[PDB]
Design a protein around this ligand. Structure first.
Ligand SMILES: Cc1cc2nc3c(=O)[nH]c(=O)nc-3n(C[C@@H](O)[C@H](O)[C@@H](O)COP(=O)(O)OP(=O)(O)OC[C@H]3O[C@@H](n4cnc5c(N)ncnc54)[C@H](O)[C@@H]3O)c2cc1C
Length: 483
């Protein structure tokens, strides 16, 4: 009965921030009262094909904290975040009709699940005579500024990278976070708080690289610490392949995945750092990594569902084992290969794994165990606190040899990698307590321990730590034999 003035609605998904947010910026420039909404989608809390929770505890809790921080940032600027649950394509249009929204502003995604949601949502808006404005803001490089169409995206990262830089594409400046956002008059809406079961209680492990806190505020603080307070960006290139501690890399991933941090804002800060403190290979290398992120997003956009097919991007068959027992050995980190086990346990207990670790465990599953690569991609999807559909599935495709041609079989020598990237065994002892008594480099290959060593050091293979589940050289040559 009360008068409901026309308004605009900003729909949030994986862009939980107020800074450099084009949809939000365009909305406020309309000059109308703004309503903000986040809708927890039950489908994201169901399961993957092999049964894993689609959104595990590490990420669901990080998400809840990110949504909560966004609600607090909006309250701070005199507005509020409407939080509800259900199918967005159903809920958002319902809210829009009720609040008399004239337009919905949102960020566009590129993968099937996300694409169907926004597509069906817009269809409902169109039926109601409500406009929908979507923007591209997930990538460092705007799709419209690329020297080529998505369909023409080069298949080699190097060419992609060289083409964009050797063209001076230029990065769009960041939009400013608003200090005030006019809210519409109070309107009674039926909002459903998300079910508690979506966020199972978490047992934080202090061995974690970081006490990850979801949200834009925590994301900005982390950048502040890594870049400025700690002044460690200058050494990024030298420490990026590390595995122990919070500072061997930015740890920006979970915040970038939910859009708590804009990649263009990070880029902006890298440039500030380069001008104020130092410009070297490290400062440039971090940008290279953001480009890899962009690349996989465009690859996912270009290839669509092929990204999730058995044959991946290259549509290459390859036989794969469906050994559930061996897979659980991998997932639980009881393969008998310390580098792999330490990494898998870190993931299981913290939701995070270093890039160097991810490359090795993925290779071990595909090349050494020869198990359906998708099973590994699914576990990462479930367990990773920084899961990004494009980067995860894209990287798994490459590792499995179904994404990047490269006329040559490729595998990681786990035992070699272990000694090279954890020369003192620090990472290993950090995550594998049972091997803490091993004082020497045999910690990298415990199967080399003599009967005397196993007894003296209290490490009985088969009891305290598992025997290698596979012969390394043999497994590699066997999987390769699949020509
Ligand atoms: C099997 C496998 C699965 C992966 N799954 C994911 C995933 O779900 N989500 C995700 O964000 N990354 C994934 N990656 C890349 C991964 O290594 C993470 O980016 C992580 O290591 C980031 O930690 P950091 O933020 O400290 O990285 P930094 O080294 O500090 O790099 C900074 C940012 O660059 C981006 N980046 C770095 N390396 C890559 C890369 N290889 N591909 C894409 N972006 C990259 C990330 O957004 C990252 O936050 C995967 C890699 C492999 C080999």
């Amino acid at each position: 009965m009360k008068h409901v003035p026309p308004t605009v609605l900003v729909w949030f998904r994986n862009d939980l921030r107020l800074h450099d947010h084009e949809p939000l910026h365009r909305a406020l420039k309309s000059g109308l009262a703004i309503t903000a909404v986040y809708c927890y989608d039950p489908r994201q809390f169901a399961q993957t094909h092999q049964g894993f929770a689609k959104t595990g505890p590490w990420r669901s809790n990080f998400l809840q904290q990110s949504v909560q921080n966004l609600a607090e940032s909006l309250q701070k600027v005199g507005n509020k975040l409407l939080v509800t649950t259900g199918l967005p394509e159903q809920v958002i249009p319902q809210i829009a009709k009720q609040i008399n929204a004239k337009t919905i502003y949102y960020h566009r995604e590129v993968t099937q699940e996300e694409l169907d949601v926004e597509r069906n949502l817009v269809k409902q808006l169109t039926i109601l005579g409500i406009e929908a404005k979507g923007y591209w803001g997930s990538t460092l490089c705007h799709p419209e500024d690329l020297p080529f169409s998505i369909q023409d995206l080069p298949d080699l990262f190097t060419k992609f990278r060289k083409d964009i830089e050797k063209k001076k594409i230029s990065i769009r400046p960041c939009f400013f976070a608003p200090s005030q956002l006019l809210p519409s008059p109070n309107i009674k809406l039926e909002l459903t708080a998300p079910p508690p079961e979506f966020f199972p209680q978490i047992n934080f492990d202090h061995r974690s690289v970081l006490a990850f806190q979801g949200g834009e505020t925590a994301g900005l603080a982390r950048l502040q610490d890594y870049f400025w307070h700690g002044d460690r960006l200058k050494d990024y290139k030298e420490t990026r392949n590390g595995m122990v501690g919070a500072d061997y890399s930015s740890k920006f991933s979970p915040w970038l995945a939910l859009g708590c941090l804009s990649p263009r804002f990070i880029y902006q800060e890298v440039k500030r750092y380069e001008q104020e403190r130092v410009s070297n290979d490290s400062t440039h290398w971090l940008i290279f990594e953001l480009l890899w992120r962009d690349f996989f997003r465009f690859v996912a956009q270009k290839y669509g569902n092929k990204l999730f097919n058995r044959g991946g991007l290259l549509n290459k068959n390859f036989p794969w084992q469906e050994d559930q027992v061996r897979f659980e050995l991998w997932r639980s980190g009881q393969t008998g290969y310390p580098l792999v086990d330490a990494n898998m346990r870190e993931l299981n207990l913290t939701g995070f794994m270093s890039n160097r670790g991810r490359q090795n465990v993925a290779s071990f599953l595909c090349k050494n165990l020869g198990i359906d690569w998708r099973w590994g991609a699914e576990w990462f999807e479930s367990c990773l606190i920084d899961y990004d559909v494009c980067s995860n599935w894209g990287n798994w495709n490459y590792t499995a040899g179904i994404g990047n041609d490269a006329r040559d079989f490729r595998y990681f020598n786990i035992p070699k990698q272990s000694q090279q990237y954890d020369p003192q065994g620090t990472y290993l002892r950090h995550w594998l307590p049972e091997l803490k008594n091993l004082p020497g480099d045999k910690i990298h290959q415990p199967w080399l321990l003599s009967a005397t060593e196993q007894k003296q050091w209290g490490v009985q293979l088969g009891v305290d730590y598992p025997r290698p589940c596979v012969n390394f050289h043999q497994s590699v040559e066997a999987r390769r034999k699949i020509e």
